[PDB]
Design an enzyme around this catalytic site. Structure first.
Site, PDB file in Angstrom:
ATOM      1  N   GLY B 218     118.936 157.116 -44.472  1.00 55.72           N
ATOM      2  CA  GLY B 218     118.078 155.957 -44.378  1.00 55.72           C
ATOM      3  C   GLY B 218     118.767 154.781 -43.713  1.00 55.72           C
ATOM      4  O   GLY B 218     119.991 154.638 -43.741  1.00 55.72           O
ATOM      5  N   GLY B 219     117.959 153.928 -43.109  1.00 54.02           N
ATOM      6  CA  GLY B 219     118.440 152.763 -42.392  1.00 54.02           C
ATOM      7  C   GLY B 219     117.611 152.521 -41.146  1.00 54.02           C
ATOM      8  O   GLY B 219     116.878 153.387 -40.669  1.00 54.02           O
ATOM      9  N   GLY B 220     117.735 151.313 -40.604  1.00 54.19           N
ATOM     10  CA  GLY B 220     116.981 150.941 -39.427  1.00 54.19           C
ATOM     11  C   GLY B 220     115.519 150.656 -39.678  1.00 54.19           C
ATOM     12  O   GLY B 220     114.706 150.812 -38.760  1.00 54.19           O
ATOM     13  N   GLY B 221     115.155 150.243 -40.893  1.00 57.82           N
ATOM     14  CA  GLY B 221     113.780 149.951 -41.241  1.00 57.82           C
ATOM     15  C   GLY B 221     113.027 151.096 -41.887  1.00 57.82           C
ATOM     16  O   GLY B 221     111.923 150.872 -42.403  1.00 57.82           O
ATOM     17  N   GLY B 223     113.292 154.938 -44.347  1.00 58.80           N
ATOM     18  CA  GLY B 223     114.064 155.632 -45.355  1.00 58.80           C
ATOM     19  C   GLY B 223     114.492 154.785 -46.530  1.00 58.80           C
ATOM     20  O   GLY B 223     115.314 155.240 -47.332  1.00 58.80           O
ATOM     21  N   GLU B 340     131.731 148.466 -52.163  1.00 56.98           N
ATOM     22  CA  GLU B 340     132.197 149.377 -51.129  1.00 56.98           C
ATOM     23  C   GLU B 340     133.518 148.901 -50.556  1.00 56.98           C
ATOM     24  O   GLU B 340     133.846 147.712 -50.592  1.00 56.98           O
ATOM     25  CB  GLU B 340     131.186 149.522 -49.989  1.00 56.98           C
ATOM     26  CG  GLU B 340     130.351 148.286 -49.686  1.00 56.98           C
ATOM     27  CD  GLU B 340     130.044 148.152 -48.222  1.00 56.98           C
ATOM     28  OE1 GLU B 340     130.981 147.836 -47.458  1.00 56.98           O
ATOM     29  OE2 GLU B 340     128.878 148.366 -47.828  1.00 56.98           O
ATOM     30  N   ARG B 344     138.612 148.733 -42.294  1.00 60.35           N
ATOM     31  CA  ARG B 344     138.975 148.108 -41.035  1.00 60.35           C
ATOM     32  C   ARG B 344     139.061 146.610 -41.237  1.00 60.35           C
ATOM     33  O   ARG B 344     138.514 146.050 -42.190  1.00 60.35           O
ATOM     34  CB  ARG B 344     137.979 148.416 -39.918  1.00 60.35           C
ATOM     35  CG  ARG B 344     136.538 148.480 -40.383  1.00 60.35           C
ATOM     36  CD  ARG B 344     135.553 147.772 -39.524  1.00 60.35           C
ATOM     37  NE  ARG B 344     134.759 146.908 -40.383  1.00 60.35           N
ATOM     38  CZ  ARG B 344     133.453 146.688 -40.288  1.00 60.35           C
ATOM     39  NH1 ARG B 344     132.710 147.261 -39.347  1.00 60.35           N
ATOM     40  NH2 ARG B 344     132.887 145.871 -41.162  1.00 60.35           N
TER      41      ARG B 344
END
EC number: 6.4.1.2
Lengths: 73, 930, 73, 73, 74
Positions: B218-221, B223, B340, B344
């Site tokens: 899911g992601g990007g609007g 899911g 989380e 980096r």
């Protein structure tokens, strides 16, 4: 205009690219024939070397390349 | 103070490393590239006395090259790469390896770009003997997706978690390395992921109402579904199962509205991991960081130290090197939750640099060379140890030694548009001037020349401010932001940041991760100038452009031998501007090249306007001065006043078809009352004896105003069209009032010799063609004449002039003449109001000529003749007294009149103009002035 | 940030050269250009501006008038 | 510095001072604009802070090597 | 105009510290330039910057350069 100004140098390249394509392989498909027959029609003397060499190819690519004659005879 | 290094090899030898790095590839662009190069070069000069001891290679796309990206000029070497999306240039790990081996480099730095989230890159680089400035891939795997992260956090000192599928965990591995083998935690994965329709409900029964369900992809609007009820869970749950069919779904508890904190972790390749300090990053818009603050002042010492300990334990047991961040969700009651680990370096990492006196990217370089933490200089200073030594540091026993110094605010400048949401914008830069100051700095990925292209992300610069405490830091940031200037085609979110920093909720530190979202829904896009000022400024910009274009085109015509009539060189412009639905209609004219007059509804205001070399205008309006800029768009005018922006709409709404030019109407193509579609020709007109059709703009029912066969004027009304009126209905309510007015600089009773210059210059400018309109002309001109006549008959005028010219030159005047002049003018003053009162021009001239009759030689000659020229001019003007001077002035004006009007006798306009053109061959501005 | 207003004296030279201080100032007044004795080292002019535009103070700094003891008087 | 120290003047084409931690500075002219005949020398000042002498030197040197001033002067 | 006013070769002369250098400059591409002196040639990758300067790649090292032409000096 700009590319036309260096016509002689371009002609040197053209001859080198003919010799490496239609050299020791006297056969011409019906895509190279169109180019060669168009190229021999450049009547201006600046483009003689290319029109000459092309002609030499086109006329030379009718004689069997010596294996056919050896075998048949 | 005995360290003598010149090359990285010697440095590695002395400090106990195992890998020499002389070339670094940057697999990134923009800000990240800039920052990496700059910080490491500073360190390089510090250690090697050579700012270019470490060479940096960059990958350049044609887009970044054409946009003149800032990092290109900084780099030592560049290699071109294919452009387009990130997967062709920077997120292609195999391409990164190909460059890294083609050009022999010893390390690769990725930072916070696009490849530092791909665990495959460290593998590819390590297999070829190339040092990646970041974690190994095994960590990034163990730090995989979200389920594995929530599980692995619970193997050592367990941070609270909001039921990441559940609250169940695995066995204890306090300080042992382990991989995410799917034998023990598989159970948790089976509970972390759901298959049937009623599997997710088993979470909902324990977590409560605010349930968040997300697919593994899911992601990007898509899911993602947020369940607010208890009985509506099956609906949105099955929806998520349908959003990504065939993939496993997971269910987690949604966060409350609280604070987002971060811990910065740094670690070497020998198992030593330390916590640097934290950050408070709770200013977010749609989960995007905006403002960050370095001291984590919300968390009390006990709980915050606990969070640091947990973060370090995680980093040690998983096997993380170089640097990374651990996020926590801090609840108001002193309870934190794990979120989380980011493997980096973050963009907001300077926040912890500035308060720790460290350099993180340089620390990454030194770690990559295999140097342990107890040999890096800044770390050694941080724990109270001599930098120039090799003694080990007991990081656990001395963990109380580090202490933040001050407080830092980091504000990021984005390219979004707060007007109409936050749509990312792009375009060219015209000016980028960041005025730095004490304790304030910042840097940008683009220069004044250059721009932002389609694939160029937002966040084109960062500002930082230091202070001793929170309040000082805020003050520095606010002032600095109000002083910077960013101008271009794109929009630049800065003013919104200012408004946020001046909000009391921020300053009192009463904010949460949902603060800005709530404020957005409340329509807080304030920081607009006053309406009246904006109207005046926009009017001036429009009129000035029109006037300059008229002048340029007319003069160009004169140069080519064409004569245009004298009504295309106008001095009056009509301007129309809509603001917040209200239409304002104004006239703009000039009383001089610099004096503009804005007229609305019969009321006038005067403004002093000066053209700036940078394209803007300097105004003086009501005492206050302003610097203003304008950009003309397709249907809008963007007016910048100081550091505030005001946007005016250009009316195109009534949906009336208009002739673009003069000419004649021949016929209409369609029936009156027929429907027309946009792009279809509706009419045929002819200008130039050459026929030109006319396409409709909008689709609707057309009714024609002019009958076939008619004269057309540009902008005339040809045909109306009925549409469905989507919006912009009745956007007129024509303003009928009066503009501000309190001053005017008429010099009412100010010194009387300044009034002379004022009125005379106004009258001269009248003689040169600068004249008010009908009801205003001769309403002020008569007063100018009367005031001039009164001034010229006042005997006190010439001595006032003398006062100014004599006082301005005290030195370089012989004392003899100085004393004599002062005496003579004093006598003249004593005799005012007497019929025998005459200005002693001859006597002043006499004493000056006496000194010149002495005639000092050799630089004492010329100094006297030159520094007395003003006095000579004054006495020459008043040889016959105030009477002669008065007559002289008025005569000179009459001569101006004749100088122009004797040239336009003897025939028609064009013939006279050609005569002037043929006389003034070498200058066409003279002709234009006539 | 603008509780104290600042008035500046502007020569045509500094205006044409787009001097930085011009844009920062709150108000500007033009003065005659040329050497310092016409614009900034003229103490009587400074007084004239200070009274023409009602100001409560005058700052000179390290320019040209701060070496003239007559200005404070 | 070439041929003595004669004061020069003219237009600015670029003025980019890249500030950093513990470094700042300011100028009396912007990228648009220039220095005229009566405009004195000393058109800008850079400052650098450090804990001691050596650090301050280092900061100043790097910052000076990173700035860009281009113009007629 | 005839096809000899659109040349692709330029002769450049520059004096440095009393020493005169005479070079020819041509191109193998819009971006690839060749500098020739005394029968020796070097290739340079040149890109035009929007700010008026040039980005060079010469011997591995890249450079950003600018020129101003004066009455008698470069």
């Amino acid at each position: 205009i700009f590319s036309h100004a260096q016509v002689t140098k371009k002609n040197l390249l053209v001859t080198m690219l003919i010799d490496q394509l239609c050299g020791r392989d006297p056969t011409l498909t019906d895509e190279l024939l169109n180019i060669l027959t168009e190229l021999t029609q450049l009547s201006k003397t600046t483009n003689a070397k290319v029109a000459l060499r092309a002609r030499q190819v086109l006329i030379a690519s009718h004689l069997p390349s010596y294996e056919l004659r050896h075998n048949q005879v | 103070r005995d360290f003598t290094v010149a090359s990285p090899a010697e440095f590695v030898t002395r400090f106990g490393g195992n890998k020499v790095i002389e070339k670094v590839l940057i697999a990134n662009n923009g800000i990240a590239a800039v920052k990496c190069m700059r910080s490491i070069r500073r360190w390089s000069y510090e250690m090697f006395r050579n700012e270019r001891a470490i060479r940096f290679v960059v990958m350049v796309t044609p887009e970044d090259l054409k946009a003149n990206a800032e990092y290109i000029k900084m780099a030592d070497h560049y290699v071109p790469v294919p452009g387009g999306p990130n997967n062709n240039n920077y997120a292609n790990v195999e391409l990164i390896l190909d460059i890294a081996k083609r050009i022999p480099v010893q390390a690769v730095w990725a930072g916070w770009g696009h490849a530092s989230e791909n665990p495959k890159l460290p593998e590819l680089l390590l297999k070829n003997g190339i040092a990646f400035m970041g974690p190994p891939s095994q960590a990034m795997w163990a730090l995989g997706d979200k389920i594995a992260s929530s599980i692995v956090a619970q193997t050592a000192g367990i941070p609270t978690l909001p039921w990441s599928g559940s609250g169940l965990r695995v066995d204890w591995q306090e300080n042992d390395f382990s991989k995410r083998i799917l034998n023990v935690p598989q159970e948790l994965y089976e509970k972390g992921y759901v298959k049937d329709v009623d599997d997710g409900l088993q979470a909902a029964e324990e977590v409560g109402y605010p349930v968040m369900i997300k697919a593994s992809e899911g992601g990007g609007g898509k899911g993602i579904r947020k369940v607010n009820n208890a009985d509506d869970f099956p609906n949105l749950f099955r929806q998520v199962q349908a959003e990504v069919p065939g993939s496993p779904i997971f269910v987690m508890r949604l966060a409350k509205q609280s604070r987002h904190l971060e811990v910065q972790i740094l670690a070497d390749q020998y198992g030593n991991a330390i916590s640097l300090f934290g950050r408070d990053c709770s200013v977010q818009r749609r989960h995007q960081k905006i403002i960050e603050e370095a001291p984590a002042t919300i968390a009390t010492p006990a709980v915050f130290e606990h969070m640091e300990q947990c973060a370090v334990k995680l980093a040690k047991m998983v096997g993380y090197v170089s640097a990374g961040t651990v996020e926590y969700l801090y609840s108001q009651d002193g309870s934190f939750y794990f979120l989380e680990l980011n493997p980096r370096l973050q963009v907001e990492h300077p926040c912890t640099e500035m308060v720790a006196d460290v350099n993180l990217p340089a620390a990454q370089l030194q770690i990559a060379m295999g140097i342990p933490l107890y040999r890096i200089k800044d770390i050694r200073m941080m724990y109270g140890v001599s930098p120039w030594g090799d003694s080990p540091i007991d990081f656990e026993d001395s963990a109380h030694v580090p202490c933040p110094r001050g407080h830092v605010i980091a504000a990021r400048i984005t390219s979004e548009n707060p007007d109409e949401g936050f749509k990312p914008s792009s375009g060219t830069v015209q000016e980028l001037n960041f005025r730095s100051n004490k304790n304030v700095w910042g840097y940008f990925s683009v220069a004044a020349a250059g721009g932002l292209h389609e694939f160029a992300d937002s966040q084109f610069g960062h500002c930082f401010s230091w202070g001793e405490n929170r309040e000082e830091a805020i003050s520095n940031m606010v002032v600095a932001l109000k002083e910077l200037s960013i101008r271009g085609d794109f929009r630049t979110t800065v003013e919104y940041l200012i408004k946020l920093l001046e909000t009391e909720s921020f300053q009192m530190n009463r904010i949460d991760t949902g603060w800005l979202d709530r404020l957005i829904a409340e329509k807080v896009q304030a920081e607009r100038p006053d309406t009246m000022l904006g109207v005046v400024c926009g009017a001036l910009h429009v009129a000035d452009v029109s006037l300059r274009n008229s002048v340029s085109n007319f003069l160009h015509s004169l140069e080519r031998g064409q004569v245009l009539p004298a009504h295309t060189l106008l001095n009056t412009v009509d301007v129309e501007l809509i603001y917040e639905g209200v239409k304002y209609v104004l006239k703009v004219t000039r009383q001089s090249p610099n004096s503009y007059v804005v007229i609305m509804n019969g009321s006038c205001v005067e403004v002093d306007v000066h053209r700036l070399s940078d394209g803007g205008l300097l105004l003086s309006y009501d005492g206050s001065s302003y610097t203003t800029y304008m950009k003309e768009e397709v249907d809008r005018y963007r007016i910048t006043i100081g550091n505030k922006t005001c946007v005016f709409e250009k009316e195109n709404d009534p949906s009336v078809m208009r002739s673009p030019s003069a000419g004649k109407l021949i016929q209409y193509i369609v029936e009156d009352g027929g429907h027309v579609f946009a792009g279809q020709c509706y009419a045929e007109i002819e200008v130039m004896k050459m026929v030109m059709t006319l396409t409709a703009v909008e689709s609707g029912c057309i009714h024609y105003v002019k009958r076939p066969g008619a004269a057309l004027d540009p902008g005339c009304v040809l045909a109306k069209m009925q549409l469905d009126n989507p919006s912009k209905v009745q956007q007129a309510e024509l303003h009928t009032g009066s503009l501000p007015r309190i001053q005017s600089t008429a010099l009412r009773g100010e010194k009387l010799h300044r009034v002379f210059h004022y009125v005379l210059d106004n009258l001269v400018n009248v003689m040169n063609g600068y004249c008010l309109p009908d009801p205003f002309f001769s309403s002020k001109v008569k007063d100018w004449v009367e005031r001039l006549m009164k001034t010229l008959r006042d005997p006190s005028l010439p001595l006032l002039e003398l006062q100014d010219i004599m006082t301005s030159v005290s030195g370089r005047i012989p004392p003899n003449v100085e004393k004599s002049i002062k005496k003579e003018m004093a006598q003249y003053a004593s005799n005012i109001t007497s019929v025998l009162c005459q200005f002693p021009s001859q006597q002043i001239a006499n004493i000056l000529d006496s000194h010149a009759a002495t005639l000092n030689r050799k630089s004492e000659r010329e100094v006297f003749f030159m520094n007395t020229q003003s006095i000579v001019q004054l006495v020459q003007r008043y040889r016959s007294g105030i009477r002669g001077h008065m007559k002289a002035v008025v005569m000179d004006l009459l001569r101006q009149y004749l100088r122009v009007e004797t040239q336009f006798q003897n025939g028609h306009y064009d013939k006279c103009v050609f005569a002037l053109r043929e006389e003034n061959k070498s200058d066409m501005n003279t002709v234009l002035n006539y």
